Design a protein around this motif. Structure first.
Motif, short mmCIF file in Angstrom:
data_model
loop_
_atom_site.label_atom_id
_atom_site.label_comp_id
_atom_site.label_asym_id
_atom_site.label_seq_id
_atom_site.Cartn_x
_atom_site.Cartn_y
_atom_site.Cartn_z
N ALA A 266 16.29 -23.20 19.06
CA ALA A 266 17.20 -23.65 18.00
C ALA A 266 18.64 -23.23 18.34
O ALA A 266 19.56 -24.04 18.24
CB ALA A 266 16.76 -23.11 16.65
N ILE A 267 18.80 -21.98 18.78
CA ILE A 267 20.09 -21.48 19.25
C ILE A 267 20.64 -22.31 20.41
O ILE A 267 21.79 -22.71 20.39
CB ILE A 267 20.01 -19.99 19.60
N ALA A 269 19.85 -25.37 21.13
CA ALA A 269 20.18 -26.68 20.55
C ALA A 269 21.58 -26.67 19.96
O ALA A 269 22.38 -27.57 20.22
CB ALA A 269 19.17 -27.06 19.50
N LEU A 270 21.86 -25.65 19.16
CA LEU A 270 23.20 -25.36 18.64
C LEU A 270 24.26 -25.21 19.74
O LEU A 270 25.28 -25.89 19.68
CB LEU A 270 23.15 -24.11 17.76
N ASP A 271 24.03 -24.35 20.74
CA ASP A 271 24.94 -24.23 21.90
C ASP A 271 25.20 -25.57 22.58
O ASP A 271 26.32 -25.85 22.99
CB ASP A 271 24.43 -23.28 22.99
N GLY A 273 24.83 -28.61 21.30
CA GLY A 273 25.20 -29.69 20.38
C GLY A 273 24.17 -30.80 20.25
O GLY A 273 24.52 -31.98 20.17
N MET A 274 22.89 -30.45 20.25
CA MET A 274 21.84 -31.46 20.08
C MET A 274 21.15 -31.27 18.75
O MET A 274 20.88 -30.14 18.35
CB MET A 274 20.82 -31.43 21.23
N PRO A 275 20.88 -32.38 18.03
CA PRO A 275 20.26 -32.30 16.72
C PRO A 275 18.74 -32.05 16.76
O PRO A 275 17.96 -32.95 16.46
CB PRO A 275 20.60 -33.66 16.11
N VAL A 276 18.34 -30.83 17.09
CA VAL A 276 16.94 -30.44 17.17
C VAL A 276 16.54 -29.83 15.81
O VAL A 276 16.22 -28.64 15.67
CB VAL A 276 16.71 -29.48 18.37
#
Lengths: 476, 476
Positions: A266-267, A269-271, A273-276
């Motif tokens: 999740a982190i 994904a955030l780094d 920029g993907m909508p996971v």
């Protein structure tokens, strides 16, 4: 001397890998930070197999064919660096360190580049299957030094699980890529467990099904499109009676643990920029569950709808809709998973292979399923596929799911049963298929309180508001 | 020499702070990494006010009363460390460095402890209000060296926005706490913008409202419970006509930007194990929006429900339900925000003040609203309140919202309009109020494929399955 490879770290996991290798006709040298476990292992389950022990680190190193192949199955973090640091001096250029633990990929990126500086070869490898998966055929996801692959290939593919003759192990890619892919597998795992738990919850609290009834539904679903290991064990858990005939699972404290690999996805994904979103929700839901006492307190004061005994008239339709909700949501989560992989390939400059990754997840691993075979197939056909949802098989599945997916969500919504994962999957789906999202207002808002500027839609470009230029408007 | 404080970094933001201080009867020394901007600023807007320039770093330092108060408003990262490193030698023990930029709090934790080692005082301060907020009264959120507070108190509180006589600035807490609280404010900000955009989207694509009609709805909502700066500018943006009479906002490219402070909150939530789901979804939704071309492509192939012209029969009821959905969701997001603050206080050992933080967010900042005054009030009454939702005012608001909240979600669900933030808020709400969540199955699953063990519910403790002990079951 004699030993195709050695393995340090004799927890149940590593013991079973050594055993697995031995059974496949490899001579393995077993060793540990300590001694008791080496002697004990040689005394019992390694007895009469091609498994030899070691006493010193130099002894271990001496018992191994060239180039030396040193696998570590130790606790993640500094203990991995500990072993590496005391092994490097006893080694020579072209020798191979394999980290098989659940290491965070930036660490593997680092160990790779440091060992590379000394001419030592590095393999950071994901391992999945648990105790029994390690004994008979785990999923193995090696990455690091490409030039180490021809040397570990036969050991790895021989011991790995097979899916239709094919080994669940290919070279993942450079540096920390094997551990990266293992991380994402674990994120996906969190997602599948949360989705399953939501189906259970809706049947239990909304449907009023007994556990045996929910178990039979999972029995039924496993016979179809949702066929998978996690659905199987869930089916099995739900019928499992405690010593008193009452379902054991209903006695378990509802506070989920997490060792960490799940939040990492999740982190990341955030780094990236993907909508996971689904993996995110799955991690947050475990965080929510941890808050047991706060929730008991919340339950006594906060209101919500009554769930009447007759909320579900048509149990067959209810169950059929739910199956499509679970299945369609799962397709979203995996589509998000591969978007992440797609962006990581691109950002990190790693040539990640989508069919091979899906292949590696088809068997051996916790998330193994027929569904994954269908993902391999889609990427074999189009390895450049930008999103899973553009594949006909998944597009059709999602089209067929529409009615059951939305109906189950509206139902959980109306009756107050939490569906974080189902909900985020539908929101993502409906957002993803929107040519135009309300992020136009978001951009206007930002340009207003911060003059952050905005771009114009190419179909709306004009005298003022030109294409490919950063526009600011004086909104006041 | 003469100057209450100096400020380095003469972007519009810092210029307006200096101006604000000058107007409040402070002598400020203005300086920059460069020169043009100092002379230019002294030549124009600083002219005839108590603002003096500087030429050297030593010149700047020499013009400042004791203990020296050096504020930086520069780009986050290494440039902040640049200034610090060239200022420390020109300083003496008890002098105060103030970082007012949007710095990531672990950096502020670090700068604080490093400067502390040299006996220099550090203040890492959040600043919010934008250009015009800096000119007339920003929100200021100072943290770092407590012993620096009596020295900056009068400057800070004088220049800060006022809410009912009270300055929007109190000492936040130690080390990186001011920047931490500023971070969370920005996470909350993302949440409020996403929630507003979802209301807009539902009225536009589901209701078929014109922008002027949606503008009037925001006009109406701003006159009630949702009274806030973001609702005001949204109302204003929606009626704003381009040079051609067509709504300008509908021409803006729907790809949201993010400088970073927003993902930081979601990442921190993940690190801390707090279910800050809405901010997460808000960040992921910007990530989704960035994918413009992928979405155009997705829109042509992926199916979804038709939205008929008559989907909304009762426009008044539709709008009234939506208001409750927006409002209740916002209450969830803020409740999540303060859970984060609660956990960060506890994990970091920072004595964060909930009423003061809410006070600091009441005015000056982008998220300013009447709602925030109501949060201050709740925490004044009970500063030990474990969750916002246990406050009567918010509990009543959420109780009243129930029907409108669920109806709007079921409606967006049924008609295929993405509501990531509304959806996650309801899922969180319904999860949070559950005495028992399906994390019991999650735990059973984990204990099954990994022997990770589980605890028993104290009300289910028995002969086997004892309380306060880690149980493993052989499920096979």
């Amino acid at each position: 001397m004699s030993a195709d490879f050695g393995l340090i770290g004799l927890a149940v996991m590593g013991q079973n890998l050594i055993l697995n290798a031995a059974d496949h006709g490899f001579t393995v040298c077993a060793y540990n930070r300590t001694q008791s476990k080496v002697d004990h292992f040689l005394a019992n389950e390694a007895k009469g197999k091609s498994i030899i022990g070691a006493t010193s680190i130099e002894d271990f190193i001496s018992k191994l064919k060239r180039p030396r192949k040193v696998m570590l199955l130790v606790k993640a973090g500094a203990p991995v660096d500990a072993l590496i640091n005391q092994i490097v001096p006893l080694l020579e250029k072209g020798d191979i360190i394999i980290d098989g633990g659940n290491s965070h990929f930036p660490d593997s990126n680092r160990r790779y580049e440091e060992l590379k500086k000394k001419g030592i070869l590095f393999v950071g490898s994901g391992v999945s299957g648990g105790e029994e998966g390690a004994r008979y055929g785990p999923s193995l996801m090696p990455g690091g030094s490409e030039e180490a692959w021809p040397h570990i290939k036969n050991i790895f593919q021989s011991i790995s699980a097979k899916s239709d003759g094919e080994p669940c192990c290919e070279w993942v890619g450079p540096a920390g890529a094997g551990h990266y892919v293992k991380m994402v597998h674990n994120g996906i795992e969190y997602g599948d467990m949360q989705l399953i738990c939501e189906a259970y919850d809706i049947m239990k609290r909304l449907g009023g099904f007994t556990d045996k009834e929910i178990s039979d539904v999972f029995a039924k679903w496993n016979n179809g499109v949702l066929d998978s290991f996690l659905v199987e064990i869930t089916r099995d858990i739900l019928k499992f009676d405690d010593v008193d005939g009452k379902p054991l699972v209903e006695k378990i404290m509802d506070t989920a643990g997490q060792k960490g690999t799940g939040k990492w996805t999740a982190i990341n994904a955030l780094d990236l920029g993907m909508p996971v979103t689904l993996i995110g929700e799955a991690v947050f839901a475990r965080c929510l569950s941890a808050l047991k006492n706060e929730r008991i307190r919340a339950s006594k004061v906060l209101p919500g709808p009554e769930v009447p005994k007759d909320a579900v008239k048509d149990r067959e339709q209810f169950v059929d809709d739910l199956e499509q909700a679970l299945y369609a949501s799962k397709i979203i989560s995996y589509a998000q998973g591969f978007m992440l992989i797609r962006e990581a390939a691109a950002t990190y400059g790693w040539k990640l292979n989508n069919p091979a990754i899906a292949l590696m997840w088809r068997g051996g691993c916790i998330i193994r399923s027929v569904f994954l075979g269908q993902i391999t197939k889609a990427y074999r056909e189009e390895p450049d596929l930008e999103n899973l949802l553009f594949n006909k098989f998944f597009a059709d599945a999602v089209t067929k799911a529409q009615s059951g997916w939305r109906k189950s969500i509206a139902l959980a919504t109306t009756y107050g049963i939490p569906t974080p994962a189902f909900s985020t999957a539908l929101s993502f789906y409906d957002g993803y298929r929107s040519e135009r999202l309300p992020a136009n207002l978001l951009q206007a808002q930002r340009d207003y309180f911060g003059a952050h500027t905005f771009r114009v839609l190419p179909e709306c470009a004009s005298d003022n508001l030109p294409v490919d230029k950063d526009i600011h408007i004086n909104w006041t």
